[PDB]
Design a protein around this nucleic acid. Structure first.
Ligand SMILES: Nc1ncnc2c1ncn2[C@H]1C[C@H](O)[C@@H](COP(=O)(O)OP(=O)(O)OP(=O)(O)O)O1
Ligand SMILES: [Mg+2]
Ligand SMILES: [Mg+2]
Lengths: 538, 345
DNA sequence: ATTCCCCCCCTTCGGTGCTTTGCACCGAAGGGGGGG
């Protein structure tokens, strides 16, 4: 019955007390369901009948589980949770199907009644009390106290996992060849033993689990591929995600677009070159999760492209420790990047994408060295080793960035593939002042109160412009006098600003940014041949 | 000695664990499994809410992986010129005798760490210490207070100079800059394994006027400027404040560092250059520079500085563990702002 | 209309720190996806 596993000692944050929340009204359907589940769990010794303790009561409810016609009884334990001590969660992440080797013998086994099989500390069973309501109306209502782990408490996850470990441990010492993936109570058991011989150890693991009262039903015992594991359809040599159904609708509410972005983010780990930026910009602003957002033009063709990638079927492959890990990054435009991890051409381990904008003003070199750090950590997570990169940037284009940048920046062992479009810096700033160049001393300042600022420049040959502007700032006006030093000068110009803000935004070679002023400066720093900049505090 | 507690007001470390490599995870597993049988650590469960990051380093001996725990919050939350001999005062390490003194039972719950798994195939395996660990600030005090009985047999008839340190590496002070590589380490061999523009730039550099040294003019310097011309010692460190270290990258693998207590009042300044070699591995030079400045703050002052590294957060967090070869883990922030004003330092 | 942990992405909002009391960066929290 209830596992003979020892219990985990759980206390309440010093001073707090149990939940006296009432039992919110429930529909007769869920009333019947609750009474049936509760009657059987009573006979087994899962929930004990409660008498006159304190009046601890946490509400109960019930949802339909998976695709089954069975009901899952859950309990709103938000109140107990807030006053229960804190637990260090042990699950440090989810298992990915591409860190798994190809194995001739594999079984997927699931412990049934997983939480209601591990004991709960007796000196804490009180607080978990509940009041199954009445089928009629006000009949007293049988009230019980959970003896097993409740399906809604905060400590239940961590306690089950740490415990399932101490049950699988003696079996792991006996079988070093066996490979067990334990996610909560889902078990992936793989070895390169003979099928007839393998089965015999899947008949022995089951008995080891049963000795600790963990039944493994033979209805959810997947014995032959294609296995359904962690949302993936794992065939013996190839693995793929289970079918992904993108919603098809005419009107697109904010929540529908959020669902679409979520599905395409999930569908971007196997499908190549998935873009969501043109759709993810329809969620900036509107907060009404029901406003009917009309689909634009820059997003309709992007959604169509995403749908055409999801037309033909793709599949990954399994990790081969002998071979080498490669990552091929491609720039897709508008700050979007894609990457593919593989060991042989036209056979990918896992695909991906990077479209984050980490900063105010940044170029493609920094945005690529950020994607490199992402794939690097994802690989240390999945495979434990750094891959070798195939970045589309010239060796000297990165060498000049590495030696003319004040920050320490690295990319690990990488190599350059000549495929368009290559990442490049669109302009450069001279080291020494340019001989025979018009010099522009630019200065722009505003009045905090009146909000209008004057910005202008003084040159060495009479030219002297001053322009006023409104709704400005004592920094935004300064970064405008430079724009007036680029909009009148020829193909060669020397600029002497006075701001540490102006330089820093300019000295980092930006190529795109939110500020329409900075972007307009960048546009005219590109058509200029040899620009120079310097700062003098006078 | 044993009775130790936490600085009043706070609870304990709750730092998450960063991903590791199989070359590190396997070493950590083989070290923890071996330590468990010696009664040095003990398995725990989720009911302990505390957590400190862990990893492994290949020390310069390059014989065995050593374990390291990011015991920084456990020092920030725990309450409680002699080395002028030679120059680069140098020593080995003292962290394997630390296991001979047990931890206080009420304290052991704080020193908890987790061992991750590759591909997250298994929930993390948690442990907590049972003896005095390496990297906890109190542990040298609790150990020294009772084991100073051995901090004299090595002397016998040897005056030498001062010694001491902060974390585990008890630094010595031999003025002898010769000998058979200081073969006089016989009692040190014992009681360790057996317990027992030119004008523009130049005026720019003169902005460092009253800031650093109060009382400058910088007016006749700008006499030939601001117009229309063709561009064609005695430091004071209060031993209650924290030394601050600043590092600037100046190209060609050349770094400049300045240790100051108050802004624009520098007690130490230097330049570490490694030219090529690490070459593209800039993070290896910075990480080396960090192990260069820090030990200096130990030899002359005693406390590690707080480092304002010029590196990005993600790059440092990803790659600093590979090149680290020191027991201490100093504290650091990241300078997300050009410290490249106008050709200074 | 109701719950719990874990990973990810995308957007919003409020500390924080130097400074240039504004702008830039960063962590935490909404929403969405996936899993059990
Ligand atoms: N929707 C949920 N809400 C809360 N906890 C859940 C939920 N789904 C799963 N869990 C937790 C408690 C479950 O015992 C455990 C594993 O879920 P699952 O294996 O699907 O259910 P189960 O083992 O109780 O039923 P079954 O008999 O179908 O296996 O994870
Ligand atoms: Mg189950
Ligand atoms: Mg399941």
């Amino acid at each position: 019955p209830i596992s003979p596993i020892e219990t985990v000692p759980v206390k309440l944050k010093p001073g707090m007390d149990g939940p006296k929340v009432k039992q919110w009204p429930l529909t007769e359907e869920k009333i019947k369901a609750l009474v049936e589940i509760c009657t059987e769990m009573e006979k087994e010794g899962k929930i004990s009948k409660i008498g006159p303790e304190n009046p601890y009561n946490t509400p109960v409810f019930a949802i339909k589980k998976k695709d089954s016609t069975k009901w899952r009884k859950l309990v709103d334990f938000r109140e107990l949770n807030k006053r229960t001590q804190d637990f260090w969660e042990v699950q440090l992440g989810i298992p990915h199907p591409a860190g798994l080797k190809k194995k001739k013998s594999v079984t997927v086994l699931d412990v049934g009644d997983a939480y209601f099989s591990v004991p709960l500390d007796e000196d804490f069973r009180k607080y978990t009390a509940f009041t199954i309501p009445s089928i009629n109306n006000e009949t007293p209502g049988i009230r019980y106290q959970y003896n097993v782990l409740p399906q809604g408490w905060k400590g239940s996850p961590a306690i089950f996992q740490s415990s399932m470990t101490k049950i699988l441990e003696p079996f792991k010492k006996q079988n070093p060849d066996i490979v067990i993936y334990q996610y909560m109570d889902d078990l992936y058991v793989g070895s390169d033993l003979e099928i007839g011989q393998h089965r015999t150890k899947i008949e022995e693991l089951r008995q080891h689990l049963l000795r600790w009262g963990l039944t493994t039903p033979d209805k959810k015992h997947q014995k032959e591929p294609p296995f359904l594991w962690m949302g993936y359809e794992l065939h013996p040599d190839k693995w793929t995600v289970q079918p992904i159904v993108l919603p098809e609708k005419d009107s697109w509410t904010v929540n529908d677009i959020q669902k679409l972005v979520g599905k395409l983010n999930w569908a971007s780990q196997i499908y190549p070159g998935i873009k969501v930026r043109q759709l993810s910009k329809l969620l900036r602003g509107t907060k009404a999760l029901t406003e009917v957002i009309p689909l634009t033009e820059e997003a309709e063709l992007e959604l169509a492209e995403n749908r055409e990638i999801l037309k033909e079927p793709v599949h990954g492959v399994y990790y081969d420790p002998s071979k080498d890990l490669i990552a091929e990054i491609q720039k897709q435009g508008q700050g979007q990047w894609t990457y593919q991890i593989y060991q042989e051409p036209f056979k990918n381990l896992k695909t991906g994408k990077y479209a984050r904008m980490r900063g105010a003003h940044t170029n493609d070199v920094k945005q690529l060295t950020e994607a490199v750090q992402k794939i690097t950590t994802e690989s240390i997570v999945i495979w434990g080793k750094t891959p070798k990169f195939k970045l589309p940037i010239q060796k000297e284009t990165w060498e000049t960035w590495w030696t003319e940048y004040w920050q320490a920046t690295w990319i690990p062992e990488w190599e350059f593939v000549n495929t368009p479009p290559l990442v490049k810096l669109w302009y450069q700033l001279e080291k020494e002042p340019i001989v025979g160049a018009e010099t522009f001393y630019v200065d722009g300042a505003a009045n905090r109160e009146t909000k209008l600022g004057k910005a202008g420049y003084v040159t060495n040959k009479g030219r002297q412009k001053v322009v006023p502007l409104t709704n400005t700032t004592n920094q935004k006006t300064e970064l405008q006098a430079i724009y007036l030093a680029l909009q009148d000068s020829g193909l060669e110009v020397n600029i002497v600003t006075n701001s540490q803000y102006a330089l820093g935004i300019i000295q980092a070679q930006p190529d795109k940014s939110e500020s329409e002023l900075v972007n307009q400066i960048i546009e005219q720093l590109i058509k200029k041949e040899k620009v120079y900049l310097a700062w003098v505090p006078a | 000695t044993v009775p130790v507690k936490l600085k009043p007001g706070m609870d304990g470390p709750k730092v998450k664990q960063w991903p590791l490599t199989e070359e590190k995870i396997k070493a950590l597993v083989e070290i923890c499994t071996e330590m468990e049988k010696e009664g040095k650590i003990s398995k725990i469960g989720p009911e302990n809410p505390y957590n400190t990051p862990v990893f492994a380093i290949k020390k310069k001996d390059s014989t065995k992986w050593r374990k390291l725990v990011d015991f920084r919050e456990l020092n920030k939350r725990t309450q409680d010129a002699g080395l002028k001999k030679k120059k680069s005062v140098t020593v080995l390490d003292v962290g394997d005798a630390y296991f001979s003194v047990p931890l206080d039972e009420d304290f052991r719950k704080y020193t908890a760490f987790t061992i991750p798994s590759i591909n997250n195939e298994t929930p993390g395996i948690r442990y907590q210490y049972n003896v005095l660990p390496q990297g906890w600030k109190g542990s040298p005090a609790i150990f020294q207070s009772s084991m100073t009985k051995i901090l004299e047999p090595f002397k016998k008839q040897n005056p030498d100079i001062v010694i001491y340190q902060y974390m585990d590496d008890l630094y010595v002070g031999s003025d002898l800059e010769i000998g058979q590589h200081r073969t006089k380490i016989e009692e040190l061999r014992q009681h360790l394994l057996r317990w027992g523009n030119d004008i523009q730039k130049l005026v720019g550099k003169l902005n460092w006027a009253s800031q650093i040294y109060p009382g400058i003019k910088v007016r006749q310097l700008c006499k030939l400027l601001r117009g229309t011309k063709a561009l064609t010692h005695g430091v004071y460190y209060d031993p209650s404040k924290d030394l601050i270290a600043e590092i600037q990258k100046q190209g060609q693998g050349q770094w400049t560092y300045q240790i100051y207590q108050e802004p624009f009042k520098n007690l130490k300044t230097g330049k570490y250059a490694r030219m090529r070699g690490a070459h593209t591995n800039d993070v290896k030079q910075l990480t080396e520079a960090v192990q260069k400045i820090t030990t200096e703050s130990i030899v002359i002052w005693g406390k590690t500085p707080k480092f304002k590294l010029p590196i990005q957060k993600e790059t440092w967090e990803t790659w600093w563990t590979e090149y680290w070869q020191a027991t201490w883990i100093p504290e650091w922030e990241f300078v997300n702002t050009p410290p490249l004003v106008k050709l200074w330092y």
